[PDB]
Design a protein around this nucleic acid. Structure first.
Lengths: 149, 392, 134, 210
RNA sequence: AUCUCGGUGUUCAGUACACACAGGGACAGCAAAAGCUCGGCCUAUCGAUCCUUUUGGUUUAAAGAGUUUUUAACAAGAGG
RNA sequence: UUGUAUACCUAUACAUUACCGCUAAAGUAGAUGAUUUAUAUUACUUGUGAUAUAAAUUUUGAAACUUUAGUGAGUAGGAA
RNA sequence: AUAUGAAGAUCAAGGUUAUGAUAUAAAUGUCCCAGUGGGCCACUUUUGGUAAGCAGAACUGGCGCUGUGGGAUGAACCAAA
RNA sequence: CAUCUAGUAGCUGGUUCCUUCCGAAGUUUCCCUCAGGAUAGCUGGUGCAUAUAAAUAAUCUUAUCUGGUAAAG
RNA sequence: UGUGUUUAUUAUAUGCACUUGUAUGAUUAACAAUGCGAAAGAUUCAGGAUACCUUCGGGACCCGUCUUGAAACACGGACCAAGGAGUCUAACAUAUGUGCAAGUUAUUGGGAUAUAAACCUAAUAGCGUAAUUAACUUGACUAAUAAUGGGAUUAGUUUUUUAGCUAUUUAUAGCUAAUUAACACAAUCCCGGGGCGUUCUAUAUAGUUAUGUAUAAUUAUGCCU
RNA sequence: UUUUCUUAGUAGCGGCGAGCGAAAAGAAAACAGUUCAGCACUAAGUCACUUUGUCUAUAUGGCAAAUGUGAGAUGCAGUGUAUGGAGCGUCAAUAUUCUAGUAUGAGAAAUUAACGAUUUAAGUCCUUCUUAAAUGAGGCCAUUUACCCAUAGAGGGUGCCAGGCCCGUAUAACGUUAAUGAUUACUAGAUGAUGUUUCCAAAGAGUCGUGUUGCUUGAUAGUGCAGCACUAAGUGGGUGGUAAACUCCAUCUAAAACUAAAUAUAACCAUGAGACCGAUAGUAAACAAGUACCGUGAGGGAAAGUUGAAAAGAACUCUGAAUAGAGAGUUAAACAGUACGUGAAACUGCUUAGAGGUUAAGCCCGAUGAACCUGAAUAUCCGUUAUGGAAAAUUCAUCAUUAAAAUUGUAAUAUUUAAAUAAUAUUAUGAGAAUAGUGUGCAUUUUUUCCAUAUAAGGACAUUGUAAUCUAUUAGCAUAUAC
């Protein structure tokens, strides 16, 4: 499926050594096998390029459950793309007929973070968890966050 | 890009009947782009999905208890077969270079033979094999005798979908002047030049027309036995059958209820599809695409520079020390002193041949004293210049 | 999909008529309306209607029966005669190469057709010329 | 080896070519599993294809709070309120599984309509043409009008993408949540510290008349 | 011969330790005061991971929830 | 042998030229009555321009043609 | 004790870009990309050693990796790639 | 004897078509390291940013700083 | 520089028609001799290491290999024919191709049939779109309008302002030294800001709200700590 | 329960080094549930033999009789089972009906499946080459130029490549088996839920557990397993990824048992395939191959396919003691005669041609003798000439006239892209061309098409010699000036 016509086995026919030198030509494992020895003769290669290899920074969680730190998040940055496409500007008549009741647990999201630059319209967001700046820019525009599961 | 704009493909009846009472616009697939390198790559990866696994036996070459006589037994160090009395000891075992050894790396049955192509990239290649099954520059370049075929796309009635015998089916191809591509199919019937002949592919022909149909009342049975012909449903549309070989431009015969459904399968240039949920037609990188109209074109032509036209071959360096016509070209005022010294050199001659010949002093006429005694008496011609020019 | 410059790049390296011929790098192509069989850009099959084909005869060994340009008024979806319009000069060599330079008031492919016609007339000249050779 | 390489970790130290599995019967298992389903569905009656009932509630953890998948059950006290029939429901095929104890009432009312939705769709070909109490119809027979054999009997579902967007607009401009979660956190963070000082400070008056 | 937080020089791969340095933030010594004292006038006098072990928050976790013991974890030393 | 004199001989070096490559730069893409060129009628400048009638070259595998310059040692090795 | 310091941020005013010569196109990333990690010879300077076609270094040029002319001959010298 | 087993080898040996272009290294640090690595240098490939000055960059002159070797004592 | 005295020398003032006179825009072009490419097949002239043979002068050691150095008294190779050594796979990286692009990828399955292919498709999931911290927490500035905010270096843009060349509908065009604007695209350089962590510290905490001092009765009515 | 995808190379484990490494949830495939022991079952209510009647497989069967002999109270059946139950009570449906069997035929094949060498459409039609062989080449009224057939054009055979000569193939027919079960008959067994509600009530011991010890695991103050020591409880006991004690909460019910399906499959029975190998390959084995052969034995284990279409497998004669040689003969051919297709290289017997004391040979470069081979004039100077002849189209001939077919450029309408714009058809319009027809004329002096006749030559071509020019270059002379 791969070429070989473009591979270099086909260009080294027939030059003697096949890419590898007269002198210290291709032998089986001349530094060892795999990640060994990372503290001895491959020391420099493991720091640089991999610092933080060899040690132990700690707290052993026997049986992590990744269904505990789940929390899908969403910035204020988007947040208006969730409500449909033409209500974007159909409310900026100007006519404040609408704070959109958004429920993020029906959109798969659990926290509302706040990176934002949000517009001046009210919303009614219903996330599980809060960012503090999220609830400080939605209150600044006449909105809520209904603290709901 | 904007789709129809050569539109009205006409339906032809059984008797080739230069139109009908029906007229369909182009279903907008036929202006979607034909990229022949996408199709070549998508076809190639997708025809690998019919491959079967091969491998040598995993125990072959390795059915020997053969170790190495080491050194120094005057024979090289490979695993030689053990015992006695049987031609086979002690002979050479296990190696790629031995006779009976395992091959260099044996072929395994877990090569990746099949392939995952993106689905949107197999929709791109199907679309570029329908827009090339119009365009009679491209059907005429897959071979494909079509200089008596009525329209591109050939749409025929739904009455072709009821053809039930192969006798009726070849008359339809005779009446619609499709039979001249079947006759080129029979002239291509060969044997393969392999090796494939021993492996169940000795041969039959090359490819012919493709009859896209909508319903099958009888026509896949009736067209089954004709060489080169194959019949295909609208909604499926194999790319392996619609651009065979990775090459675009198969002669394709639609019916009419298989031509109504190309606006549902592939989308439209305004809306998406109905049957390929979310598919939009691919946009080209070039809408107008006629580089001949564009290079004319008076928006472009009024801003260009000039073709300024003389071409400068213009080489040989002449030597302006043995040339004079290259010295008097590069340095005029060479001419001025080259004349001013050659005229004085011609005047030094006359003063010499005069002052020598005072011991002979013969003539004064023409022979050895034309270049002497004429200019010795043309100093009377500069007696005027002192005498008659002081009137100013 | 409409252009010939697009059409060519789809065929300029594989079509049924391309003849690669091992050494002199690309001169050949065998499509029935070429006039100088080369694969060039539009000395070519389909040009969409300036496909000029000078051919013999029809009555071999008569004259140069020219398959002409097929131009606009059918679609160019092809025949059962619909797209091709086929007119054939005769009678001479000097008074039909002028009534083929005159049937082509427009000048670009003319002199490929005035050399393909002047070589079809030469190709059936040995039925009158180059006699019994005593 | 030479360097910058995403440290290798590939578990091939263990002679895994005796463990290799190849899957070229994958096209051939699609054909046989399909042809088993066809031969199953032809061999029942006009019964459903799949087809018993399989109740609907509630993928377990927080990650799948919201999804409402298909169960294996119907819960002997989901059957009970729905006019069933705990050992009649195995025959018309209602999945009667009884290691499931129903926790909520909502979980039991989510699936007690589903036992009356179907059985209001289930025509009961009779035994004797006496029509004991089917009580659907005579001439909606399985002689006559049935034989359609639906696939999945589904969840329905029925929007929950969702989005029928309501607007009020609402008045709760005073009632904060950036501090309601920092206090319901540290209520339970400090439950034991507050309930230990509660049984020393509020048990200082019991030594008066003791 | 203090507490802290980076930065630099050397060796150098411009990695580490270590040794020196030049600063910022304290808090203190001497001095009437300016002074700039961050060990020894300067160039030597020394040491990773894992482990163990102190000091340290007046802590974080043991994943059903509290309470105390235990263990763990993190910062800084020591044991080589 | 030492010190000199002229005159020659001798490289794959140097110069010029022919040819190959490589490098680097530049040109060319109105074909519909497109561009020219030689004649043959008129506006007019003396002369040129325009209409008209007298032969050709050009659909440059736009990955093609055309123009000009420099350049050429090679193991291990890389690349077309 | 200066909201003259010292840094910074702005408007003003300044002939002819401030030795020479050059421009093999230079700049910057990535594959940390292959081979290599035994060297050896020479002028000059050097250390050890009685000395060595010996041992060890600094400098630039060479052979390795390179034909051709010269030294009869020759890895390295002279000339020239 | 057969299998595990094609056990492993920093070691010896061999490693298969042509032309074109560019062209090394035997040094650094570190390693139970000294017939070997990893590391940096040297190499190639692939680009990219800038083509009908006052941008800069590298051996001399000028200005200035540095030096303890030859010589000198 | 100036002007005459002056005596010398160059240049411009050669239009029309014609012709076997330079760059032929790397020029090589002419006169003459020999020899006819015979209907089938000779001959004349020039050329040819075709595989050789003959003859002669110059050159010329035996290849592969490891090596600082091989013709080596280093190893291998008597000769032929066939066979004979950089692969497959898992995972990652860079690069290029291609598709779609806040996405993307159906490929475990299920459908639909035409056949191990091709076609359609649910619900998931992976990776990405949000990180940090040992952990608990926490989570990316008021751009609805600032691409990193600001600065510097900045290719381009009817941008945009200001003398002449060129065609003058006396317009409008195109080219240079200039006034601007732009995120001045991208990329580098610098200075900031923000999330988190850790440490200093300004919390008299003024405070601010809230279970609580108000009654109705679980609820909504006060200021305060 | 099991299998796949994902979780996840994750949590964990590890000289915390090398390395290793699961599971819940989620998504699929498939789905099927149950039985005991132990209670106030409340008449051993059970079973195996054997014999005797008597059914209808060639029955470790069916029923009954004697209840003949035994198992069984140290516990057999029925009810009933941790997911628990059993009796009362209500309340609401409620028989001569059902479920499961075998027997039987609905049905004059009535369906469907699998299996059957029993059955098939159309050319061996007319000429070339083979005249060794046709399956190859040509041809075959029109039906829109298939000769015919085709739901059959897969493959194989047959003296070359065959849809039509043959087997098959496609669709089927027939034939055989099996499955279906309308009724009837007999033997069984049975005749619901329950908003609800009082009483009765059995839950597995040297076994969990704990200590230790050993192996094992991802399991870390124990993941599983085992030995030993210790040995439970009945609101008890196990688990909740960190040991312990308290008080909770959730969650199951261990120490007894059965169970289809999805899943696996280098073996076996029968098949189909292939981007596989093509006789030093592919199995070791294409063949009398696990053979010949070797080893005391365990074991080791080859090599070896091909005459031709047909044996037509070389009668016969001569020579010889003879296989044989020579001549015949068969054959398309014995350069096909059993190294039987082809027949390479190494290596040489003979022939033929030159040469030989000249690195040992071979070699390179430049020539050479001999041999052989390759390529090469298409008409004038200071001109693809004036004349003169010859032929023929009979739209052309110059034109005029006519009939068409398109092009180009205007106009218009319907379509796309709704306003123009464009592009596509469908019409019309004009000028100029071209095609076929007729005619001052066929040549009326022209038009096409051929041949001797001038200027300076055979000119052109190649190979030479000459002469001149330009580049790069070598040598030689001397016309004057300055210092």
């Amino acid at each position: 499926m791969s070429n070989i016509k473009r591979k270099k086995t086909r260009k080294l026919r027939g030059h003697v050594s096949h890419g590898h030198g007269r002198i210290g030509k291709h032998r089986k494992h001349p530094g060892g096998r795999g990640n060994a020895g990372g503290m001895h003769h491959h020391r420099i290669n493991f720091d640089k390029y991999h610092p933080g290899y060899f040690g132990k920074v700690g707290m052993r969680n026997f049986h992590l459950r990744r269904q505990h730190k789940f929390r899908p998040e969403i910035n204020l940055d988007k947040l208006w793309s969730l409500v449909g496409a033409e209500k974007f500007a159909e409310l900026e008549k100007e006519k404040s007929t609408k704070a959109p009741v958004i429920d993020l647990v029906k959109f798969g999201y659990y926290k509302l973070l706040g990176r934002g630059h949000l517009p001046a319209r009210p919303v009614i967001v219903k996330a599980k968890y809060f960012s503090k700046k999220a609830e400080d820019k939605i209150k600044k525009a006449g909105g809520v966050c209904l603290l709901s599961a | 890009s904007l789709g129809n704009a050569r539109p009205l493909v006409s339906v032809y009846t059984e008797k080739n009947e230069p139109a009908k009472d029906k007229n369909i616009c182009l279903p907008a697939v036929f202006k979607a782009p034909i990229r022949p390198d996408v199709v070549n790559e998508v076809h190639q990866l997708l025809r690998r999905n019919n491959r079967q696994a091969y491998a040598v036996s995993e125990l072959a070459g390795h059915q020997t208890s053969a170790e190495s006589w080491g050194t120094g037994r005057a024979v090289a160090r490979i695993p030689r077969v053990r015992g006695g009395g049987t031609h086979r000891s002690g002979q050479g075992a296990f190696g790629n270079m031995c006779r009976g050894g395992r091959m260099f790396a044996p072929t395994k049955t877990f090569r990746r033979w099949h392939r995952k192509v993106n689905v949107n990239q197999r929709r791109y290649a199907l679309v570029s094999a329908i827009a090339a099954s119009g365009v009679p520059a491209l059907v005429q370049s897959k071979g494909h005798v079509i200089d008596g075929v009525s329209e591109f796309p050939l749409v025929v009635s739904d009455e072709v979908q009821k053809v039930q015998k192969t006798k009726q089916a070849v008359i339809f191809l005779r009446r619609l002047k499709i039979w001249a591509d079947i006759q080129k199919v029979y002239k291509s019937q060969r044997f393969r030049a392999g090796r494939g002949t021993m492996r169940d592919r000795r041969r039959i022909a090359r490819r012919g027309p493709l009859v896209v149909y909508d319903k099958d009342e009888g026509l896949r049975k009736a067209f089954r036995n004709i060489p080169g012909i194959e019949t295909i449903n609208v909604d499926k549309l194999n790319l392996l059958k619609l651009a065979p070989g990775g090459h675009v431009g198969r002669f394709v015969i639609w019916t009419e209820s298989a031509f109504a459904r190309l606006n549902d399968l592939f989308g439209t240039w305004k809306k998406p599809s109905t049957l390929k949920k979310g598919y939009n037609l691919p946009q080209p990188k070039m809408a107008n695409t006629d580089l001949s109209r564009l290079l004319k074109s008076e928006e472009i032509r009024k801003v260009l520079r000039d073709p300024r036209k003389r071409v400068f071959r213009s080489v040989r360096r002449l030597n302006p020390l043995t040339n004079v016509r290259q010295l008097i070209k590069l340095n005029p005022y060479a001419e001025v002193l080259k004349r001013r010294a050659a005229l004085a050199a011609e005047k030094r001659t006359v003063a010499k041949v005069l002052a020598k010949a005072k011991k002979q002093n013969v003539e004064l006429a023409k022979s050895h004293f034309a270049n002497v005694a004429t200019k010795a008496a043309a100093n009377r011609a500069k007696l005027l210049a002192a005498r008659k020019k002081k009137v100013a | 999909a409409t252009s010939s410059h697009l059409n060519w790049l789809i065929i300029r390296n594989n079509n049924a008529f391309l003849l690669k011929k091992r050494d002199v790098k690309k001169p050949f192509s065998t499509e029935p309306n070429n006039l100088a069989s080369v694969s060039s850009y539009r000395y070519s099959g389909i040009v969409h209607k300036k496909t000029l084909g000078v051919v013999p005869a029809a009555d071999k060994k008569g004259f140069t029966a020219v398959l002409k340009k097929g131009k606009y008024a059918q679609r160019p979806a092809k025949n059962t005669v619909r797209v091709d319009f086929k007119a054939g000069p005769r009678r001479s060599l000097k008074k039909l190469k002028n009534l083929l330079i005159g049937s082509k008031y427009r000048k670009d492919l003319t002199q490929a057709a005035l050399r393909r016609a002047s070589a079809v007339l030469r190709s059936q000249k040995p039925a009158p010329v180059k006699g019994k050779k005593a | 080896g030479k360097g910058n390489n995403m440290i290798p970790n590939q578990h091939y130290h263990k002679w895994w070519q005796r463990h290799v599995k190849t899957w070229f019967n994958q096209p051939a298992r699609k054909v046989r599993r399909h042809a088993n389903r066809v031969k199953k569905a032809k061999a029942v009656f006009p019964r459903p294809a799949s087809g018993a009932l399989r109740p609907v509630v509630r993928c377990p953890t927080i990650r799948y709070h919201t999804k409402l998948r298909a169960g294996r059950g119907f819960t002997l006290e989901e059957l009970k309120g729905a006019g069933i029939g705990a050992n009649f429901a195995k025959t018309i095929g209602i999945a009667v599984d009884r290691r499931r104890k129903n926790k909520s009432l909502e979980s039991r009312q989510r699936n007690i309509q589903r036992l009356k939705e179907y059985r209001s769709k289930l025509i009961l070909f009779p035994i004797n043409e006496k029509k004991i109490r089917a009580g659907e119809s005579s001439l909606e027979e399985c002689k006559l009008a049935t034989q359609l054999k639906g696939p999945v009997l589904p969840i329905k579902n029925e929007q929950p993408a969702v989005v029928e967007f309501r607007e009020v607009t609402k008045d709760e401009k005073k009632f904060k949540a950036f501090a309601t979660l920092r206090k319901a956190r540290t209520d339970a963070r400090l439950v034991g510290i507050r309930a230990k000082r509660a049984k020393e400070a509020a048990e200082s008056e019991d030594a008066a008349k003791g």
